[PDB]
Amino acid sequence: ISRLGPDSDFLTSVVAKASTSIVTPADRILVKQPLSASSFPGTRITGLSSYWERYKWLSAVARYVPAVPNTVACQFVMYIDTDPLDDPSNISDDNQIVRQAVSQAGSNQFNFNTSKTVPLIVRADNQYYYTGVDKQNLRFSLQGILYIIQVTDLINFNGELITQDLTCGSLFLDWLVNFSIPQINPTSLTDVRVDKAVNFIKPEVSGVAEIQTVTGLSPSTSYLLTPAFLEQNFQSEAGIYILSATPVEGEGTISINMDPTVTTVSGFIKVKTDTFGTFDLSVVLTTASKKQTTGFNIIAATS
Amino acid sequence: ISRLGPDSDFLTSVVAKASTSIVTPADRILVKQPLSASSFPGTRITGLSSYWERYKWLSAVARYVPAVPNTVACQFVMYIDTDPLDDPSNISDDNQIVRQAVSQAGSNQFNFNTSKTVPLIVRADNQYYYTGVDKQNLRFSLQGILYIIQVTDLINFNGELITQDLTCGSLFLDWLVNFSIPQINPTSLTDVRVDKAVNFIKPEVSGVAEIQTVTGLSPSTSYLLTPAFLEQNFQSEAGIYILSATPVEGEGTISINMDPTVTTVSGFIKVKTDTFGTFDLSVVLTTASKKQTTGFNIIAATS
Amino acid sequence: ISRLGPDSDFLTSVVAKASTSIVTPADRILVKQPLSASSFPGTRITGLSSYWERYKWLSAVARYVPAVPNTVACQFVMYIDTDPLDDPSNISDDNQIVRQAVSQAGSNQFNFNTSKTVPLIVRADNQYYYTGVDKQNLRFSLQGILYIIQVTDLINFNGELITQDLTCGSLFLDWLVNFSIPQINPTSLTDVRVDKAVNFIKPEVSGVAEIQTVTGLSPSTSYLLTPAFLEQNFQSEAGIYILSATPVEGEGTISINMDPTVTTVSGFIKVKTDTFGTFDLSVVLTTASKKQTTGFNIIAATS
Amino acid sequence: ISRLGPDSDFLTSVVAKASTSIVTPADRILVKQPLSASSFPGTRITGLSSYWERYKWLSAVARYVPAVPNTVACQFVMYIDTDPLDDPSNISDDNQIVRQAVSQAGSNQFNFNTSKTVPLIVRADNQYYYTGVDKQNLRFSLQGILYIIQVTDLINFNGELITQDLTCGSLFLDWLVNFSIPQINPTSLTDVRVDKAVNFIKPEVSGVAEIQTVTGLSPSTSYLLTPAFLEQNFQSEAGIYILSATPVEGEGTISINMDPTVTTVSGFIKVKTDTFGTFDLSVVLTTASKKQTTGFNIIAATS
Amino acid sequence: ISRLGPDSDFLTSVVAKASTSIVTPADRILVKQPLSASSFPGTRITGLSSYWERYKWLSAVARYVPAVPNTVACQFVMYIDTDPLDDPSNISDDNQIVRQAVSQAGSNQFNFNTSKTVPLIVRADNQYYYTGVDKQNLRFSLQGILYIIQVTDLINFNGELITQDLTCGSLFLDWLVNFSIPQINPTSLTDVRVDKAVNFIKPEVSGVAEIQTVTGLSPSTSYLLTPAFLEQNFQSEAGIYILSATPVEGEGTISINMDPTVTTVSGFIKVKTDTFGTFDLSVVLTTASKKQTTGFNIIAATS
Amino acid sequence: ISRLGPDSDFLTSVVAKASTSIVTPADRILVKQPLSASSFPGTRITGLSSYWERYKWLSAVARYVPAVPNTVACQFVMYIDTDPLDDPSNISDDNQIVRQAVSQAGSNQFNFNTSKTVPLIVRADNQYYYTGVDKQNLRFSLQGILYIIQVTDLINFNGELITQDLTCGSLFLDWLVNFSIPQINPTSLTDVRVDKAVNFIKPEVSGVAEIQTVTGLSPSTSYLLTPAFLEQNFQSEAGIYILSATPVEGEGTISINMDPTVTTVSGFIKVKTDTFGTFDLSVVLTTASKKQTTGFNIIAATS
């Protein structure tokens, strides 16, 4: 078994809600964060969790630090329920949901402008849980679920109720794990993202290619270029709008043909930047008399 | 320091080239594979290498297994040059490039239908190299570069020359590392990929949405949907082609407006599958009398 | 090796910026301070670092103390990236830049009115870095770069956004180093400074020298006197403006000749003060009938 | 206490004077060098001495090496008087000043073409002396004063008197100190220096700026630019001489206005070089028809 | 690691320059010799350094022995700067460049007719430097650079200035290294040299070959013969100048055809000598009536 | 004594000859390779052997690896005769030469498609042999001579005779030596080589020099440039062919003067490349109207 840690990991922010925004006792739950190893998308532990099969938090002490002044006050209670199918979201009594919160071991009751810690209590046996995204049963792959309950109305410096929502802190983990059995573990968790939208150049000479240089991107990362344009009237003048762009080093072609007899808006470009964060592509137009702009999107895997 | 391993990693295939395809002594180099921790895109070690700053192969024994029968023969030589700026690609003598290959320590000389191993010789000091993609100088972040040289013409069962290229084996690592100083290490290495191209449905009723169910994808992975169509004549009949698709659960919109007065082909959809590998989206057309098909691409981060 | 410390060193102030002043995720970086031994110009460690070749922070724990009351609140995160070419200034996601901040080892997450410390994590080998100003590669001479990221909008006592910039604290180091190999290490870091601008006296008698005594300077420090005057009409009356000043003890002459046939405004004076912080110079004018004032600047090396 | 050393330090040269140049017995003293830690301006020890309060030479053995051949001869005597207010410069007998020199402990009597050493004798108590420039009393901050006396007329290869002064050797220290109580110790000892004098370019176009590139300076050091010109007749042709120079990166402006109605010759420029030792500044002239040259001085702190 | 030494190696001679030949303080540097293992072309250590990747001088004490009498005198200072990018060639003060020389550890100050030694101070870590010719950064492959500064004007037996340059000594190393990781290390350092120029014989009989025996060469070394002739008028008589020379044992042909219709002056001969230092070649002329001499050059790799 | 190894060294290839190509029993000897330390020109050991006087193989196990398939068969026998003047090349019986081969100790009898090793048996005394090229007697400087004898006709997959020669394997050493008494050992073994033949440019302007840039050479290696041209008719038009080329940095001149009154084709150029493998030279022609091409050869020491 490969023992890793201790490090930190950013889970979420927590939005303490106003006294008028709480209607049912199920509405008091501010965060419901699973503490599986594969449920913090983008952090250090979730990128590591898809390279072993099993894991076990030896000590995953959740750590709250506030972002709120010392002139507003509200009491929280914070626990880690080790039974991932027990659910406090269907308890109809507001005093019952907070007796259920303090009764859980390791719970810790704080004013929400104070840094306090909640440790995860390990199970008496040497039980390993599966990593990765969740299959059929949650009890194979979640060791705990982190809750925060609001027990008091959000008060201010004069004894009055704050009537607006207020993002109040951040939850940081401090983990220590035993991974085991290295498997590259498919159904990856890297979510792609539209990085930015930047348009092509407007060339002068018909049929002669030009080099367009885009700047301000990450150094030496592979991107994916998809064409998409917004609200262009290609029939405001004569000619056929034909745009074909290729990378000078990468792979793929983009064909933009706004001929209404045969219309083709397709293609993709795979190209990585240089060490400065730039890449260049050759754009050629058969009819350069048309000056309608055309954009393209930058798709990248961020985590 | 976190000691990891031992495991295996698939580097490349190796294409043993014919006797007529070798012209200069620089052409004998079959593979030039850097043995940095961040230069095997998609494997286990490269996914792990961007979560620590430094690394050191305590034992990275490269292991060749063949995929060629016992009736063709060719002698290889295989070494790991620990000086990543020394380059054998500019040596003009064919006998010099193979005396330079056997003189390197840890080199191993095999017939190419035989499984033989080449160990990486560590440096006498306790020197750590940086992970991640390479910056200015290669000697900060490459511990070795793996070469394979072809020293004999590719012969067959009767003593004659094979005149075609022949993929012959595969290179597997057996690594053992000391990582250190956990940093999430930006400029990620996850390259995105066009997964498959599948088109929208052809609905019957104008203005009433329908649910399109795409199957055969990975379970519980986040995708990115980009619109692109190929060679459609939207002016073969009357009407305005307006297609708007939204996910029922995810995020984003796709607008396909083939009005030649204002043309908008844009948008993206972020949506993840269910546990069966399917996801569904609501497609509505204002004018359903037009039966031109429209496609969309599936962008996903694969590693 | 000469082991020095522990002492303190003033790095910078940190200007926590308002919620409207943050546009891109790269704008959240408040300070980007290199923690090389030669990158704190004027402190104790940078004056010492140019008298040895190498250094290694055994413990350089950065220490934040606030200068802001307990009625405004904002959460910081603070880390020391040991890889001086990894750059978080080109990450396009605001949640990614703060997961990258907490994942770094030794990071520490605080409300910005609270004194918290961030230790520098040493590298597993015994690696020495060069001192002095940076040459070609930064990884030879920077052991870490200190960042501070703002993760929460700057809030006040009532839950409202502060709309102005607010200098909030100060960063103090607590260092402990092993220097080695004494070299006086050229390209010094002492920046000169215009100390103050004070003008000459207006003497009465032509051709007879007078002693001008300037007060209020540092005791027993060598200065440099350069002549410069502002907006004088020397042709408002007759005569030739000739001013020649020499120190009574130091070195150099200043010649001020406003003859429009041959104009000479040049010279410098090197003279040090006495133990009281004063020095005196002999000023003689050939034509004292002209009462245009003439100034001179005081150049001094401050650190 | 921080124990430093052993290293070397260049004190001075020593000019052995001729037999006709010695008139009084006080004239035999060749060098009178204080051996305080802050009295060798520019060396290694004086740059280090202003970063602690106290010091004590455990062994500061002064070391003479000659620069004179073996064909001229003269006997020296060399001692270190530990009482910095005892003065041998007011002893009227030439035989008394050399009995006073050999009687001092640690004195060493050599021919002046021979390398001999003089050790500093420490005081029987554990007495620390203050660093920095000298205040009221010298006995708080000087541990010794180094003398060299000439006891014999300067003779040559044939037994005749050399009648000219002759620089003969150099004095090198070999020190070993205990510093204590780190204080950054104001009234710094870095003396500024006119580096070189270089003039502006003569531009062609009026009102359009040009870039002047000065080369041959130290890499990555901050300078100070002061304007000063020598003997220019600005009324040899028509026009108003207006020169305004700014750095492209640094700080400050220089205004040169030779209008005799309002004359302004002022300003300073703070700018540092690049890694090649060059810096560039933008020079613009309102009236470029005047071709009088104008210079500027380069002020830099050298030690 | 293979520990080698101790042996000696001849670095250079050193030309002490006259008092009139020193203009700038950068001109005082007599030698600037890098002390890399691959920067003494022709010695023992540089021939050995291209057969391992790394090296570390455990003790490389530079040793000066003079070649000048005891009747001229000049003081040197000699140090080994361990930071190969620190450069004293851009320091504008002549007293600063010699305080920077004595402050370096291991420096040693001698009269230049005296044998003195300068040891190389090793770095506190176990750092190995690359061998071979220098790549991008010098700090990977130079452990030190050897300087010698002239601090005193070159004086003679009577106290007068020598006005001519004077080669004065020689610098010998005394090394002790740890090499590691045997690699044959391309881009070899063996520089070829025109050994001597000797011409062909003038044969009598047309079309009958003769044996030309060249003597006075190195025994059993492979040479390379290239044809080149100087100022021959081949049209002073009738006939066609055709000369073809082959070795009797070696490889290659030389064709000398001075036909102005088709002119061919080409070819090379590879042939090694016998154990006596001679080799013989067959020279045949089709038209022996022409008595113009023709030469050939002897190319050999000397180190 | 300096103990080196163990490493590998490429000796030769071995050409197994057909059944019809064997006539006399002396023709069965495939390789006759001396195992002196100075008889593998270009390898690691021969470059090291000319830097000590003596050597002794403690273990020089010769290692055969085949390059032939498993469908042809032939039996070899392989031994190392420690008596370098005993010669099996004058034994008239084919069965005697193979009884003499197996009787030698350390001999090893293999099918020629199988990797087998032959160890060198050391002599019972501690006898050192001289390095370098061989003088008068071979028994001072050869410890062994490696033979391979073919004992069986070369057969194929069906029991028939292969009638063509077939290069079959390669011989690799695995050495371990004690060198002694460091001497730089003259009559070097570096053989020079014509690298490539590339011609001059054809300039346009008479008398104005142009810069010719040759690419594709080894980085930072010193070359030697010799002029040689092939079959040029310089009298096809008017003018005098005068070509003079100099390096911009190196040493030497080439003069090409095709004046038939005084003809000079001579000169050499010594110039090294930059770090990219290129060098440039200035070519000037007095009469550029002549467009006959002229070549030059590149001489380099390869090992």
Reported as half-sphere exposure (CB side, CA atoms, 13 A), residue B246 has a value of: 7
Dist CA F193 CA F259 (whole Å) = 31
Residue whose entry in the numeric block shows the structure tokens 């390279």: A51
Q: In the 3-class helix/strand/coil scheme, how is chain B assigned residue by residue?
A: CEEEEEEEEEEEEEEECCCCCCCCHHHHEEEEEECCCCCCCCCHHHHHHCCCCEECECCCCEEEEECCCCCCECEEEEEEECCCCCCHHHCCCCCHHHHHHHHCCCCEEEECCCCEEECCCCCCCCCCEECCCCCCCHHHCCCCEEEEEECCCCECCCCCECCCCEEEEEEEEEEEEEEECCCCCCCCCCCEEEEEEEECCCCCCCCCCEEEEECCCCCCCEEEEEECEEEECCCCCCCCCEEEEEECCCEEEEEEEECCCCEEEEEEEEEECCCCCCEEEEEEECCCCCCCCCEEEEEEECC
CA atoms within 13 A on the CB side of F255: 9
Check CB contact under 8 Å for E184 and B136. Answer: no
Are C280 and C211 in contact by the 8 Å Cβ rule? The answer is: yes
User: Do residues B79 and B107 lie in contact, with contact meaning Cβ atoms separated by under 8 Å?
Assistant: yes
Residues with Cβ within 8 Å of residue B159, at least 6 apart in sequence: F72, F156, F162, F164, F166
Is A295 within 8 Å of A200 (Cβ atoms)?
Answer: yes
* Backbone torsions φ then ψ of D233, nearest 5 degrees: -100, 95
Burial A9-23 (b: 16+ CB within 10 A, else e): bbbbbbebbbeeeee
Give residue E22's identity as a one-letter amino acid code.
Answer: I
The token pair at E138 is 């010098």
- Positive/negative CA dihedral, D220, D221, D227, D228: negative
What is the phi/psi pair of residue A188, to 5°?
-65, 160
Would you give the DSSP letter of residue F110? E
* Three-class SS state of F254: strand
Whether residue E288 contacts residue E244, with contact meaning beta carbons closer than 8 Å, is answered with no
Please give the order of strands across the beta sheet that includes A75-81: A29-34, A145-150, A75-81, A108-111
Q: Using alpha carbons, select from D293, D291, D248, D243 the residue that is nearest to residue D271.
A: D248
The C-alpha atoms of residue D276 and residue D220 are separated, in whole angstroms, by: 8
Q: Token pair of F157, please?
A: 């997959």
Decide: C263 and C254 in contact? Cβ < 8 Å: no
End-to-end CA distance of chain A: 26
Residues F287 and F264: their CA atoms lie apart, in Å, by 16
Backbone angles phi, psi at B99, to 5 degrees: -75, -30
d(CA B212, CA B69): 50
CB E235 within 8 A of CB F260: yes
What type of residue sits at position A126? Answer: N
- The C-alpha atoms of residue C49 and residue C175 are separated, in whole angstroms, by 13
Asked whether residue E111 is marked as a ligand-binding residue, the answer is no
Please answer yes or no on whether E300 and F192 come within 8 Å at the CB atom.
Answer: yes
Q: Which residues of chain A lie closer than 8 angstroms to C101, CB-CB? A: 10
Q: How far apart are CA E198 and CA E189, in angstroms?
A: 27
User: D111 with D74: CB under 8 angstroms?
Assistant: yes
- HSE-CB at B217 with a 13 A cutoff on CA atoms is 29
Strand, coil or helix: A178:
strand
CA atoms of F76 and F111, how far apart (whole Å): 6
Give the H or E element holding residue A100: helix A96-103
Print burial letters for F239-274: b (CB count within 10 Å at least 16), e (below 16): eebbbbbbbeebeeebbbbbebeebbbbbbbbbbbe
Confirm or reject contact between F50 and chain E (CB < 8 A).
yes
CA distances to E7, E50, E241 from E38, in Å = 16, 7, 47
Contacts of E70 (CB under 8 A, 6+ apart): D69, D70, D71, E113
SS3 (DSSP) at A220:
coil
Q: Angle at the Cα of C108 (from C103 to C113), degrees rounded to 5?
A: 145
Q: How crowded is residue D238: how many other Cβ atoms within 10 Å of its Cβ?
A: 8
Are residues C132 and C145 in contact, defined by beta-carbon separation less than 8 angstroms?
no
Q: Is E288 helix (H, G, I), strand (E, B) or coil?
A: coil
Phi, psi torsion values for F181, nearest 5 degrees: 60, 80
Mutate to test the interface with D, among C190, C242, C273, C279 (most CBs of D within 10 A): C190
What three-state secondary structure class fits F252?
strand
Two structure tokens written together for D253: 């402006």
A210 a known binding residue?
no
**C with F: touching (≥3 Cβ pairs within 8 Å):** no
D63/D172 Cα distance (integer angstroms): 5
Task: Spell out the SS3 assignment of chain C.
Answer: CEEEEEEEEEEEEEEECCCCCCCCHHHHEEEEEECCCCCCCCCHHHHHHCCCCEECECCCCEEEEECCCCCCECEEEEEEECCCCCCHHHCCCCCHHHHHHHHCCCCEEEECCCCEEECCCCCCCCCCEECCCCCCCHHHCCCCEEEEEECCCCECCCCCECCCCEEEEEEEEEEEEEEECCCCCCCCCCCEEEEEEEECCCCCCCCCCEEEEECCCCCCCEEEEEECEEEECCCCCCCCCEEEEEECCCEEEEEEEECCCCEEEEEEEEEECCCCCCEEEEEEECCCCCCCCCEEEEEEECC
Handedness of CA E134, E138, E143, E144 (dihedral sign): positive
Three-state SS sequence of C190-233 = CCEEEEEEEECCCCCCCCCCEEEEECCCCCCCEEEEEECEEEEC
Sole residue written with tokens 């003279």: C271
For residue A180, the 8-state DSSP code is B
C259's tokens: 């003859």
SS3 letters across chain D: CEEEEEEEEEEEEEEECCCCCCCCHHHHEEEEEECCCCCCCCCHHHHHHCCCCEECECCCCEEEEECCCCCCECEEEEEEECCCCCCHHHCCCCCHHHHHHHHCCCCEEEECCCCEEECCCCCCCCCCEECCCCCCCHHHCCCCEEEEEECCCCECCCCCECCCCEEEEEEEEEEEEEEECCCCCCCCCCCEEEEEEEECCCCCCCCCCEEEEECCCCCCCEEEEEECEEEECCCCCCCCCEEEEEECCCEEEEEEEECCCCEEEEEEEEEECCCCCCEEEEEEECCCCCCCCCEEEEEEECC
> At CB < 8 A and 24+ separation, what contacts does B65-68 make?
B65/B115, B65/B169, B65/B170, B65/B172, B66/B112, B66/B113, B66/B114, B66/B115, B66/B168, B66/B169, B67/B167, B67/B168, B67/B169, B67/B170, B68/B16, B68/B112, B68/B113, B68/B166, B68/B168, B68/B169
How many beta-carbon pairs under 8 angstroms link D with E?
Answer: 90
- What token pair was written down for B71? 């009736």
Asked if residue A293 lies in contact with residue A216, where contact means CB atoms within 8 angstroms, the answer is: no
Residues of D in contact with C194 (CB under 8 A): 224, 268
**For strand D222-227 and strand D229-232, is the pairing parallel, antiparallel, or unpaired?**
unpaired
Q: Name which of A241, A190, A181, A162 is nearest A43 in CA terms.
A: A190
Which method, experimentally, gave rise to this model?
cryo-EM
User: Chain F contact for E238, CB < 8 A?
Assistant: no
Structure tokens at D206: 């009026």
Contact B127 C125 (CB under 8 A): yes
Token readout for B256 is 């396909």
Resolution in angstroms comes to 3.7
What's the distance, CA D209 to chain centroid?
Answer: 39
The answer to whether the CB of F155 falls within 8 A of the CB of F72 is yes
Q: Are E174 and E60 in contact (CB under 8 A)?
A: yes
Please compute Rg for chain C using Cα positions.
27
Closest alpha carbon to A31 in A14, A16, A10, A9: A14
Q: Which helix (H) or strand (E) holds F48?
A: helix F44-49
| Omega of the bond leading into F227 within 30 degrees of 0 (cis) | no
Q: Please state, in angstroms and rounded to a whole number, the distance separating the CA atoms of residues C113 and A67.
A: 10
Task: For residue B12, give Cα distances in angstroms to A228, B41, B91, B98, B138.
Answer: 36, 11, 25, 22, 21
Contact C172, C63 (CB under 8 A): yes
C-alpha D169/C-alpha D126 separation (Å) is 34
The answer for A288, left when phi > 0, alpha when psi is -120 to 50, beta otherwise, is alpha
Q: Other CB atoms closer than 10 Å to residue C117's CB: what's the count?
A: 15
> What does the block give as tokens for E186?
């391309």
| E262 vs B: CB within 8 A | no
3-state helix, strand and coil shares in percent for chain F, rounded to the nearest 5: 10, 45, 50
C282 CA: distance to closest CA in chain B (Å): 58
A160 Cβ contact list (under 8 Å, min separation 6): none
Token digits of residue D91: 């002893």
Identity of the residue numbered A259: D
Best of C122, C143, C177, C183 to substitute, by most chain E Cβ atoms within 10 angstroms, is C183
The span from the CA of C185 to the CA of C49, in Å, is 9
Closest CA to A2 of A61, A59, A43, A48: A48
CA–CA separation, B53 and B45 (whole Å): 13
Helix residue ranges, H only, chain E: 44-49, 96-103
Are E296 and E225 in contact, with CB atoms under 8 Å apart?
yes
Residues E103 and E88: their CA atoms lie apart, in Å, by 13
Q: How far apart are CA E176 and CA C283, in angstroms?
A: 65
Instruction: Match 């540097």 to its residue by tokens.
Output: E29
Classify residue D284 as exposed, middle or buried by CB count within 10 Å of its CB (0-12, 13-18, 19+): middle
Q: After which residues are there C–N gaps above 2.5 Å in chain A?
A: none
Q: Which two tokens stand for residue C55?
A: 């250094």
Tell whether B31 is within 8 A of chain A (Cβ): no
Of A226, A286, A232, the residue nearest A253 (C-alpha): A226
Cα angle B107, B48, A215 (rounded to 5 degrees) comes to 100
Smallest Cα–Cα separation from B280: which of B228, B209, B231?
Answer: B209
Distances (CA, A) of A94 to A28, A85, A89, F65: 8, 20, 11, 82
E contact residues 85-144, partner B, Cβ 8 Å cutoff: 125-128, 130, 132, 135-137, 140
Residues 165 through 194 of chain A touching chain B, CB cutoff 8 Å: 182, 184, 186-194
Parallel/antiparallel/unpaired status of strands B145-150 and D108-111: unpaired
Instruction: Measure the CA–CA gap between E146 and E31, rounded to whole angstroms.
Output: 7
In total, chain E counts a number of residues equal to 303
Backbone torsions φ then ψ of F123, nearest 5 degrees: -85, 145
Please give the Cα distance from B240 to A109 (Å, whole number): 61
- Contact partners, residue A266, CB within 8 Å, separation at least 6: A227, A254, A255, B228, B229, B230, B295
For residue B103, give the nearest of E1, E178, E184 by CB distance. Answer: E184
Tokens of B190: 């996850």
